[PDB]
Amino acid sequence: TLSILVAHDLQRVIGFENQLPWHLPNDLKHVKKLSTGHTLVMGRKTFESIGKPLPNRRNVVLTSDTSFNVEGVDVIHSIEDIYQLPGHVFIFGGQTLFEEMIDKVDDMYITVIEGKFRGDTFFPPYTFEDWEVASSVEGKLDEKNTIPHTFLHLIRK
Ligand SMILES: NC(=O)C1=CN([C@@H]2O[C@H](COP(=O)(O)OP(=O)(O)OC[C@H]3O[C@@H](n4cnc5c(N)ncnc54)[C@H](OP(=O)(O)O)[C@@H]3O)[C@@H](O)[C@H]2O)C=CC1
Ligand SMILES: Nc1nc(=O)c2c([nH]1)NCC(CNc1ccc(C(=O)N[C@@H](CCC(=O)O)C(=O)O)cc1)=N2
């Protein structure tokens, strides 16, 4: 099973200077819930940004670098590799992999961050004419989660 997992803002920003522009503990909790016990596939820059494998799931990194051999991580070197991974596979970023995979995934789990941040990396444009809203759930605001956000589960029409 092949899903996108992403948070993007109102203008589809996903990154700035190899980090997330927002802090939203809840959405990382959201990622944890969705991905724990399964597989994350991510590009090299994204891994480097995370810097360590994410506990309690398969972390797969797509890189051209044949020297890449990290501890806790399985490496792949082409997109085709993804299609041989077993189980529920979340495409986890970044811009490059999203652009490569958006037309290939069954569904997307998108957190819409309801703000406008400065960014240098972007989720590709997509139309609700192509995607059907299996669910939409407003995230809860509180002292530690202060930007409004919506969890979308979208399914290709
Ligand atoms: N908001 C969100 O949901 C998330 C945000 N992000 C953000 O996105 C940004 C990173 O995105 P981006 O800069 O595009 O980088 P990526 O995370 O997509 O990593 C880019 C690298 O991935 C490798 N790669 C990608 N495609 C291939 C391929 N087809 N074959 C072999 N290797 C490949 C390459 O590594 P190499 O050069 O070693 O070959 C490439 O340079 C960061 O700011 C990060 O914070 C990332 C994920 C999620
Ligand atoms: N929807 C979504 N939101 C994101 O913030 C996100 C995304 N998708 N895809 C990839 C990605 C890459 N960045 C990061 C950064 C930190 C963690 C992380 O530490 N997650 C922990 C939970 C931490 C917590 O409980 O606060 C984990 O166990 O997954 C994950 C991804 N970030």
Side-chain angles (χ1 to χ4, degrees), residues 95-109:
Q95 163 167 347
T96 67
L97 231 214
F98 290 143
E99 290 174 353
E100 291 174 281
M101 293 298 301
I102 189 161
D103 306 317
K104 296 310 190 268
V105 289
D106 309 316
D107 59 345
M108 315 196 281
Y109 298 82

mmCIF file with all atom_site columns, all heavy atoms in Angstrom, residues 95-109:
data_model
loop_
_atom_site.group_PDB
_atom_site.id
_atom_site.type_symbol
_atom_site.label_atom_id
_atom_site.label_alt_id
_atom_site.label_comp_id
_atom_site.label_asym_id
_atom_site.label_entity_id
_atom_site.label_seq_id
_atom_site.pdbx_PDB_ins_code
_atom_site.Cartn_x
_atom_site.Cartn_y
_atom_site.Cartn_z
_atom_site.occupancy
_atom_site.B_iso_or_equiv
_atom_site.pdbx_formal_charge
_atom_site.auth_seq_id
_atom_site.auth_comp_id
_atom_site.auth_asym_id
_atom_site.auth_atom_id
_atom_site.pdbx_PDB_model_num
ATOM 1   N N   . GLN A 1 95  ? 10.422 17.433 -1.652  1.00 0.00 ? 95  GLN A N   1
ATOM 2   C CA  . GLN A 1 95  ? 9.746  17.973 -2.814  1.00 0.00 ? 95  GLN A CA  1
ATOM 3   C C   . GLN A 1 95  ? 9.961  17.058 -3.981  1.00 0.00 ? 95  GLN A C   1
ATOM 4   O O   . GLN A 1 95  ? 9.047  16.784 -4.747  1.00 0.00 ? 95  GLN A O   1
ATOM 5   C CB  . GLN A 1 95  ? 10.253 19.370 -3.173  1.00 0.00 ? 95  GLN A CB  1
ATOM 6   C CG  . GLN A 1 95  ? 9.870  19.778 -4.591  1.00 0.00 ? 95  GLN A CG  1
ATOM 7   C CD  . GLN A 1 95  ? 10.080 21.237 -4.859  1.00 0.00 ? 95  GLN A CD  1
ATOM 8   O OE1 . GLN A 1 95  ? 10.297 22.020 -3.940  1.00 0.00 ? 95  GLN A OE1 1
ATOM 9   N NE2 . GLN A 1 95  ? 10.005 21.620 -6.122  1.00 0.00 ? 95  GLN A NE2 1
ATOM 10  N N   . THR A 1 96  ? 11.192 16.581 -4.118  1.00 0.00 ? 96  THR A N   1
ATOM 11  C CA  . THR A 1 96  ? 11.579 15.745 -5.253  1.00 0.00 ? 96  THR A CA  1
ATOM 12  C C   . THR A 1 96  ? 10.752 14.453 -5.302  1.00 0.00 ? 96  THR A C   1
ATOM 13  O O   . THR A 1 96  ? 10.173 14.096 -6.327  1.00 0.00 ? 96  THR A O   1
ATOM 14  C CB  . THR A 1 96  ? 13.089 15.402 -5.163  1.00 0.00 ? 96  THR A CB  1
ATOM 15  O OG1 . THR A 1 96  ? 13.334 14.551 -4.023  1.00 0.00 ? 96  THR A OG1 1
ATOM 16  C CG2 . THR A 1 96  ? 13.909 16.688 -5.011  1.00 0.00 ? 96  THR A CG2 1
ATOM 17  N N   . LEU A 1 97  ? 10.685 13.762 -4.176  1.00 0.00 ? 97  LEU A N   1
ATOM 18  C CA  . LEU A 1 97  ? 9.962  12.491 -4.110  1.00 0.00 ? 97  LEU A CA  1
ATOM 19  C C   . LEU A 1 97  ? 8.439  12.684 -4.254  1.00 0.00 ? 97  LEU A C   1
ATOM 20  O O   . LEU A 1 97  ? 7.767  11.905 -4.938  1.00 0.00 ? 97  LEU A O   1
ATOM 21  C CB  . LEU A 1 97  ? 10.278 11.774 -2.799  1.00 0.00 ? 97  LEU A CB  1
ATOM 22  C CG  . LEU A 1 97  ? 10.721 10.317 -2.934  1.00 0.00 ? 97  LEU A CG  1
ATOM 23  C CD1 . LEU A 1 97  ? 10.216 9.531  -1.751  1.00 0.00 ? 97  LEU A CD1 1
ATOM 24  C CD2 . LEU A 1 97  ? 10.265 9.682  -4.256  1.00 0.00 ? 97  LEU A CD2 1
ATOM 25  N N   . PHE A 1 98  ? 7.908  13.731 -3.626  1.00 0.00 ? 98  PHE A N   1
ATOM 26  C CA  . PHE A 1 98  ? 6.492  14.094 -3.812  1.00 0.00 ? 98  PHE A CA  1
ATOM 27  C C   . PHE A 1 98  ? 6.159  14.306 -5.275  1.00 0.00 ? 98  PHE A C   1
ATOM 28  O O   . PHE A 1 98  ? 5.141  13.804 -5.775  1.00 0.00 ? 98  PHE A O   1
ATOM 29  C CB  . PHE A 1 98  ? 6.133  15.339 -2.991  1.00 0.00 ? 98  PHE A CB  1
ATOM 30  C CG  . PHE A 1 98  ? 6.111  15.095 -1.514  1.00 0.00 ? 98  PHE A CG  1
ATOM 31  C CD1 . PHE A 1 98  ? 6.556  16.050 -0.631  1.00 0.00 ? 98  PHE A CD1 1
ATOM 32  C CD2 . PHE A 1 98  ? 5.645  13.900 -1.008  1.00 0.00 ? 98  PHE A CD2 1
ATOM 33  C CE1 . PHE A 1 98  ? 6.553  15.818 0.715   1.00 0.00 ? 98  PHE A CE1 1
ATOM 34  C CE2 . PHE A 1 98  ? 5.628  13.666 0.339   1.00 0.00 ? 98  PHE A CE2 1
ATOM 35  C CZ  . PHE A 1 98  ? 6.078  14.617 1.205   1.00 0.00 ? 98  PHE A CZ  1
ATOM 36  N N   . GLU A 1 99  ? 7.012  15.044 -5.978  1.00 0.00 ? 99  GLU A N   1
ATOM 37  C CA  . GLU A 1 99  ? 6.751  15.342 -7.386  1.00 0.00 ? 99  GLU A CA  1
ATOM 38  C C   . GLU A 1 99  ? 6.845  14.075 -8.219  1.00 0.00 ? 99  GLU A C   1
ATOM 39  O O   . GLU A 1 99  ? 6.127  13.895 -9.211  1.00 0.00 ? 99  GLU A O   1
ATOM 40  C CB  . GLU A 1 99  ? 7.751  16.374 -7.906  1.00 0.00 ? 99  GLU A CB  1
ATOM 41  C CG  . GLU A 1 99  ? 7.554  17.771 -7.334  1.00 0.00 ? 99  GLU A CG  1
ATOM 42  C CD  . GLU A 1 99  ? 8.652  18.723 -7.755  1.00 0.00 ? 99  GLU A CD  1
ATOM 43  O OE1 . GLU A 1 99  ? 9.622  18.237 -8.375  1.00 0.00 ? 99  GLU A OE1 1
ATOM 44  O OE2 . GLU A 1 99  ? 8.551  19.937 -7.464  1.00 0.00 ? 99  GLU A OE2 1
ATOM 45  N N   . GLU A 1 100 ? 7.755  13.203 -7.804  1.00 0.00 ? 100 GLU A N   1
ATOM 46  C CA  . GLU A 1 100 ? 7.995  11.954 -8.496  1.00 0.00 ? 100 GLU A CA  1
ATOM 47  C C   . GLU A 1 100 ? 6.818  10.993 -8.267  1.00 0.00 ? 100 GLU A C   1
ATOM 48  O O   . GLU A 1 100 ? 6.488  10.193 -9.133  1.00 0.00 ? 100 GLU A O   1
ATOM 49  C CB  . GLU A 1 100 ? 9.346  11.360 -8.045  1.00 0.00 ? 100 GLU A CB  1
ATOM 50  C CG  . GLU A 1 100 ? 10.550 12.198 -8.534  1.00 0.00 ? 100 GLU A CG  1
ATOM 51  C CD  . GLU A 1 100 ? 11.903 11.734 -7.999  1.00 0.00 ? 100 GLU A CD  1
ATOM 52  O OE1 . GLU A 1 100 ? 12.248 12.032 -6.837  1.00 0.00 ? 100 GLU A OE1 1
ATOM 53  O OE2 . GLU A 1 100 ? 12.644 11.090 -8.763  1.00 0.00 ? 100 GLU A OE2 1
ATOM 54  N N   . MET A 1 101 ? 6.173  11.087 -7.113  1.00 0.00 ? 101 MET A N   1
ATOM 55  C CA  . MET A 1 101 ? 5.235  10.043 -6.698  1.00 0.00 ? 101 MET A CA  1
ATOM 56  C C   . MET A 1 101 ? 3.755  10.471 -6.687  1.00 0.00 ? 101 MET A C   1
ATOM 57  O O   . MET A 1 101 ? 2.882  9.604  -6.606  1.00 0.00 ? 101 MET A O   1
ATOM 58  C CB  . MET A 1 101 ? 5.623  9.506  -5.314  1.00 0.00 ? 101 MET A CB  1
ATOM 59  C CG  . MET A 1 101 ? 6.963  8.739  -5.269  1.00 0.00 ? 101 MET A CG  1
ATOM 60  S SD  . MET A 1 101 ? 6.997  7.245  -6.294  1.00 0.00 ? 101 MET A SD  1
ATOM 61  C CE  . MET A 1 101 ? 5.654  6.306  -5.566  1.00 0.00 ? 101 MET A CE  1
ATOM 62  N N   . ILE A 1 102 ? 3.454  11.773 -6.761  1.00 0.00 ? 102 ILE A N   1
ATOM 63  C CA  . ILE A 1 102 ? 2.066  12.223 -6.527  1.00 0.00 ? 102 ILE A CA  1
ATOM 64  C C   . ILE A 1 102 ? 1.095  11.481 -7.437  1.00 0.00 ? 102 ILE A C   1
ATOM 65  O O   . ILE A 1 102 ? 0.003  11.118 -7.013  1.00 0.00 ? 102 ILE A O   1
ATOM 66  C CB  . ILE A 1 102 ? 1.844  13.758 -6.697  1.00 0.00 ? 102 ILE A CB  1
ATOM 67  C CG1 . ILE A 1 102 ? 0.427  14.135 -6.219  1.00 0.00 ? 102 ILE A CG1 1
ATOM 68  C CG2 . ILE A 1 102 ? 2.011  14.181 -8.143  1.00 0.00 ? 102 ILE A CG2 1
ATOM 69  C CD1 . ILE A 1 102 ? 0.209  15.624 -5.894  1.00 0.00 ? 102 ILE A CD1 1
ATOM 70  N N   . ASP A 1 103 ? 1.494  11.243 -8.681  1.00 0.00 ? 103 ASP A N   1
ATOM 71  C CA  . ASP A 1 103 ? 0.613  10.579 -9.636  1.00 0.00 ? 103 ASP A CA  1
ATOM 72  C C   . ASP A 1 103 ? 0.628  9.062  -9.487  1.00 0.00 ? 103 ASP A C   1
ATOM 73  O O   . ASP A 1 103 ? 0.010  8.358  -10.272 1.00 0.00 ? 103 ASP A O   1
ATOM 74  C CB  . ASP A 1 103 ? 1.007  10.938 -11.066 1.00 0.00 ? 103 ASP A CB  1
ATOM 75  C CG  . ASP A 1 103 ? 1.057  12.421 -11.292 1.00 0.00 ? 103 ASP A CG  1
ATOM 76  O OD1 . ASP A 1 103 ? 0.144  13.133 -10.826 1.00 0.00 ? 103 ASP A OD1 1
ATOM 77  O OD2 . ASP A 1 103 ? 2.025  12.886 -11.922 1.00 0.00 ? 103 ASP A OD2 1
ATOM 78  N N   . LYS A 1 104 ? 1.339  8.556  -8.490  1.00 0.00 ? 104 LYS A N   1
ATOM 79  C CA  . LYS A 1 104 ? 1.530  7.118  -8.373  1.00 0.00 ? 104 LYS A CA  1
ATOM 80  C C   . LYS A 1 104 ? 0.866  6.583  -7.116  1.00 0.00 ? 104 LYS A C   1
ATOM 81  O O   . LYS A 1 104 ? 0.565  5.394  -7.016  1.00 0.00 ? 104 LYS A O   1
ATOM 82  C CB  . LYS A 1 104 ? 3.021  6.767  -8.355  1.00 0.00 ? 104 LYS A CB  1
ATOM 83  C CG  . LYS A 1 104 ? 3.764  7.113  -9.629  1.00 0.00 ? 104 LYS A CG  1
ATOM 84  C CD  . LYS A 1 104 ? 3.044  6.580  -10.867 1.00 0.00 ? 104 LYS A CD  1
ATOM 85  C CE  . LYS A 1 104 ? 3.906  6.714  -12.117 1.00 0.00 ? 104 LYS A CE  1
ATOM 86  N NZ  . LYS A 1 104 ? 3.681  7.986  -12.866 1.00 0.00 ? 104 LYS A NZ  1
ATOM 87  N N   . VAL A 1 105 ? 0.641  7.455  -6.142  1.00 0.00 ? 105 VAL A N   1
ATOM 88  C CA  . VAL A 1 105 ? 0.128  6.991  -4.871  1.00 0.00 ? 105 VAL A CA  1
ATOM 89  C C   . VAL A 1 105 ? -1.368 6.661  -4.967  1.00 0.00 ? 105 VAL A C   1
ATOM 90  O O   . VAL A 1 105 ? -2.072 7.152  -5.846  1.00 0.00 ? 105 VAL A O   1
ATOM 91  C CB  . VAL A 1 105 ? 0.393  8.001  -3.752  1.00 0.00 ? 105 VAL A CB  1
ATOM 92  C CG1 . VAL A 1 105 ? 1.883  8.020  -3.438  1.00 0.00 ? 105 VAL A CG1 1
ATOM 93  C CG2 . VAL A 1 105 ? -0.134 9.392  -4.133  1.00 0.00 ? 105 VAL A CG2 1
ATOM 94  N N   . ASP A 1 106 ? -1.827 5.798  -4.067  1.00 0.00 ? 106 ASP A N   1
ATOM 95  C CA  . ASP A 1 106 ? -3.249 5.483  -3.946  1.00 0.00 ? 106 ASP A CA  1
ATOM 96  C C   . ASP A 1 106 ? -3.957 6.624  -3.222  1.00 0.00 ? 106 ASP A C   1
ATOM 97  O O   . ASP A 1 106 ? -5.022 7.087  -3.634  1.00 0.00 ? 106 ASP A O   1
ATOM 98  C CB  . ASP A 1 106 ? -3.422 4.175  -3.173  1.00 0.00 ? 106 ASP A CB  1
ATOM 99  C CG  . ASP A 1 106 ? -2.566 3.047  -3.740  1.00 0.00 ? 106 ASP A CG  1
ATOM 100 O OD1 . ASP A 1 106 ? -2.530 2.915  -4.985  1.00 0.00 ? 106 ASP A OD1 1
ATOM 101 O OD2 . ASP A 1 106 ? -1.926 2.309  -2.957  1.00 0.00 ? 106 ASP A OD2 1
ATOM 102 N N   . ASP A 1 107 ? -3.347 7.078  -2.139  1.00 0.00 ? 107 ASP A N   1
ATOM 103 C CA  . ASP A 1 107 ? -3.957 8.104  -1.321  1.00 0.00 ? 107 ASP A CA  1
ATOM 104 C C   . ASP A 1 107 ? -2.910 9.043  -0.716  1.00 0.00 ? 107 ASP A C   1
ATOM 105 O O   . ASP A 1 107 ? -1.711 8.779  -0.742  1.00 0.00 ? 107 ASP A O   1
ATOM 106 C CB  . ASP A 1 107 ? -4.786 7.449  -0.213  1.00 0.00 ? 107 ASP A CB  1
ATOM 107 C CG  . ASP A 1 107 ? -3.965 6.548  0.682   1.00 0.00 ? 107 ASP A CG  1
ATOM 108 O OD1 . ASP A 1 107 ? -2.830 6.179  0.319   1.00 0.00 ? 107 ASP A OD1 1
ATOM 109 O OD2 . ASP A 1 107 ? -4.456 6.203  1.765   1.00 0.00 ? 107 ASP A OD2 1
ATOM 110 N N   . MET A 1 108 ? -3.377 10.142 -0.148  1.00 0.00 ? 108 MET A N   1
ATOM 111 C CA  . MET A 1 108 ? -2.485 11.056 0.522   1.00 0.00 ? 108 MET A CA  1
ATOM 112 C C   . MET A 1 108 ? -3.033 11.384 1.897   1.00 0.00 ? 108 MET A C   1
ATOM 113 O O   . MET A 1 108 ? -4.225 11.629 2.061   1.00 0.00 ? 108 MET A O   1
ATOM 114 C CB  . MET A 1 108 ? -2.313 12.326 -0.313  1.00 0.00 ? 108 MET A CB  1
ATOM 115 C CG  . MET A 1 108 ? -2.085 12.066 -1.790  1.00 0.00 ? 108 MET A CG  1
ATOM 116 S SD  . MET A 1 108 ? -1.439 13.515 -2.657  1.00 0.00 ? 108 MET A SD  1
ATOM 117 C CE  . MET A 1 108 ? -2.949 14.476 -2.886  1.00 0.00 ? 108 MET A CE  1
ATOM 118 N N   . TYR A 1 109 ? -2.147 11.394 2.881   1.00 0.00 ? 109 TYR A N   1
ATOM 119 C CA  . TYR A 1 109 ? -2.441 11.984 4.167   1.00 0.00 ? 109 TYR A CA  1
ATOM 120 C C   . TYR A 1 109 ? -1.777 13.337 4.316   1.00 0.00 ? 109 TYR A C   1
ATOM 121 O O   . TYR A 1 109 ? -0.556 13.440 4.552   1.00 0.00 ? 109 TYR A O   1
ATOM 122 C CB  . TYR A 1 109 ? -1.968 11.064 5.273   1.00 0.00 ? 109 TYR A CB  1
ATOM 123 C CG  . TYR A 1 109 ? -2.666 9.724  5.257   1.00 0.00 ? 109 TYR A CG  1
ATOM 124 C CD1 . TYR A 1 109 ? -2.250 8.716  4.419   1.00 0.00 ? 109 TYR A CD1 1
ATOM 125 C CD2 . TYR A 1 109 ? -3.752 9.485  6.081   1.00 0.00 ? 109 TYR A CD2 1
ATOM 126 C CE1 . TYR A 1 109 ? -2.903 7.494  4.406   1.00 0.00 ? 109 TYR A CE1 1
ATOM 127 C CE2 . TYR A 1 109 ? -4.391 8.275  6.080   1.00 0.00 ? 109 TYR A CE2 1
ATOM 128 C CZ  . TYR A 1 109 ? -3.962 7.293  5.246   1.00 0.00 ? 109 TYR A CZ  1
ATOM 129 O OH  . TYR A 1 109 ? -4.607 6.098  5.261   1.00 0.00 ? 109 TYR A OH  1
#
